Design a protein around this ligand. Structure first.
Ligand SMILES: CC(C)c1cc(C(=O)N2Cc3ccc(F)cc3C2)c(O)c2cnoc12
Length: 218
C-alpha cells in the first residue's frame, strides 16, 4: 500500500518576479559601498511605527481589532548563532494580496523615482522620502524574510535574496497574532548589528522620538 498524492490542489509556495524597477533598486542596494548602512534600522522602525499608527486608529472606531493583541510595541532580536536580526511589531500587518502587491509591484514608482534622484546626486539615506525604505534592509542583509498577519487574513511568509524574484507561502509556523516580523539574514561583513551596544546606539541616534516602546532581546 504505497499511494501517491499526484495533485495537492493549491500551490504551496509561489514565486514571482519583482517589477524591473524594484529589482534594479534591490541590486543597487545590496551591492552598494554606501558607508552609512545603519539607516536600514530607522527605515524598518519607521514602517513599524506607521503600521502601529494604523491599527491604533482603526481600534478607536472598532476596539475588537485589538483582540489579536492589545499592546503596540516594537521588539528587536539579534541572534548571533543564526546570524539574524529580527524586528517584530504588533502593527496592522498585511494581507496576502497587499503583501504581494506592496513589496512586489506597487513600489515601482517610488523605486524608479529614487534611482533617478540618486543618479542626480541624492544619497541613499533619502530612501524613505520615496516610500520604499523597506529595501534598505539589503544594505545589511543577504536575504530578508517578512512574516505578516492581518486581522482579515491568515499568516504569510515572504522572502527574497534580491535575485529578481520573491516567494510567498502560507506560514503555519509560530503565530505572531497580528503585525509584521522582518528577519534579516545578515551579510558576513555586517555582523556588528548582532551586538546590543551597536543596535542600541543606532536606535538612540535615529529613532529617539518614535511613539512606541522598542525592546531589545539578546
Ligand atoms: C515589509 C515592510 C514594507 C514593512 C511592512 C510592515 C506592515 O505591516 N505595514 C506597513 C504599513 C504602513 C502603513 C499602513 F497603513 C499599513 C502598514 C502595514 C511593517 O510593520 C514593517 C516593519 N518593518 O518593515 C515593515
Amino acid at each position: 500500500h504505497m499511494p501517491e498524492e499526484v495533485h495537492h490542489g493549491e500551490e504551496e509556495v509561489e514565486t514571482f518576479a519583482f517589477q524591473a524597477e524594484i529589482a534594479q533598486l534591490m541590486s543597487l542596494i545590496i551591492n552598494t559601498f554606501y558607508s552609512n548602512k545603519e539607516i536600514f534600522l530607522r527605515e524598518l522602525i519607521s514602517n513599524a511605527s506607521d503600521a502601529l499608527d494604523k491599527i491604533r486608529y482603526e481600534s478607536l472606531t472598532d476596539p475588537s481589532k485589538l483582540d489579536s493583541g492589545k499592546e503596540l510595541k516594537i521588539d528587536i532580536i539579534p541572534n548571533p548563532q543564526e546570524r539574524t536580526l529580527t524586528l517584530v511589531d504588533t502593527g496592522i500587518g498585511m494581507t496576502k494580496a497587499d503583501l504581494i502587491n506592496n513589496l512586489g509591484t506597487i513600489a515601482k514608482s517610488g523605486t524608479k523615482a529614487f534611482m533617478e534622484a540618486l543618479q542626480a546626486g541624492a544619497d541613499i539615506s533619502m530612501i524613505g522620502q520615496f516610500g520604499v525604505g523597506f529595501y534598505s534592509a539589503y544594505l545589511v542583509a543577504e536575504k530578508v524574510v517578512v512574516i505578516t498577519k492581518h486581522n482579515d487574513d491568515e499568516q504569510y511568509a515572504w522572502e527574497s535574496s534580491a535575485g529578481g524574484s520573491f516567494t510567498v507561502r502560507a506560514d503555519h509556523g509560530e503565530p505572531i497574532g497580528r503585525g509584521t516580523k522582518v528577519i534579516l539574514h545578515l551579510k558576513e561583513d555586517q555582523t556588528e548589528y548582532l551586538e546590543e551596544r551597536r543596535v542600541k546606539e543606532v536606535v538612540k541616534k535615529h529613532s529617539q522620538f518614535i511613539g512606541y516602546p522598542i525592546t531589545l532581546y539578546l
